[PDB]
């Protein structure tokens, strides 16, 4: 174990919490509700990229914000999928659930979505070198992205060994605290097992 989670390294300074609410006597119930919610939303929809899930709670009313690659699949035009997911969130009895689906503006600048796309490719049949190169080019095209590092380890191509490969471009100052580093990790399901893909995308610095 070498490197920590960058999001947790920068939590107090650069990044923010994925869930905002305060409760002392209800902390247990709040956290177990949150775990149930995130498990539900993870297991439900894989088709549309689920970049991030944010939860806010105030008294009885509950607000869930989800960032998605393509909201067209997330909610049917008649509201079918929204109906399903709100029915599940009422099964999780959060009382009132005001649910907002949001679209992440730049798709290839989001490390979670980059990792998810590389995982999709590497799971279908795609060569891992091709996947990493396509991801790196796509991410470096966009302006705000300064540097990107893409790493995937496991049984690559069906080999009966564990290989780790990482591709880098630009600047990835992991040990810099003020450096705006956005981290992402996904575990690709293949026929030979599960292989993970981690992505770091460095987009300038945050000065407060």
């Amino acid at each position: 174990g070498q490197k920590i989670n960058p999001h947790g390294f920068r939590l107090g300074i650069t990044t923010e919490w994925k869930s905002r609410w305060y409760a002392d006597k209800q902390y247990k119930d709040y956290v177990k509700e949150d775990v149930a919610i995130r498990k539900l939303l993870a297991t439900g929809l894989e088709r549309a990229g689920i970049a991030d899930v944010e939860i806010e709670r105030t008294r009885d009313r509950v607000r869930v914000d989800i960032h998605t690659a393509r909201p067209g699949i997330v909610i049917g035009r008649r509201g079918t999928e929204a109906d399903r997911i709100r029915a599940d969130l009422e099964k999780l009895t959060g009382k009132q659930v005001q649910l907002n689906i949001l679209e992440v503006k730049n798709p290839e600048s989001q490390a979670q979505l980059v990792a998810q796309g590389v995982a999709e490719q590497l799971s279908n049949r795609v060569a891992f070198r091709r996947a990493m190169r396509k991801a790196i080019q796509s991410a470096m095209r966009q302006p705000n992205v300064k540097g990107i590092r893409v790493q995937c380890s496991g049984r690559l191509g069906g080999a009966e060994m564990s290989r780790s490969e990482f591709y880098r471009e630009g600047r990835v100052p992991l040990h810099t605290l003020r450096a705006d580093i956005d981290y992402g990790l996904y575990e690709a399901k293949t026929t030979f097992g599960r292989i993970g893909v981690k992505v770091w995308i460095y987009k300038g610095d945050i000065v407060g």
Binding site: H7, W17, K18, S19, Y22, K28, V31
Partner: peptide, 25 residues
């Protein structure tokens, strides 16, 4: 832990992910 109802491993994972409101390194 009694406050979180999470084991040490799940607490570390979720706190690094930032899904505990207030828990920071």
């Amino acid at each position: 832990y009694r406050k979180f109802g999470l084991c040490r491993i799940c607490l570390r994972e979720m706190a690094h992910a930032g899904e505990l409101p207030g828990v920071q390194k």
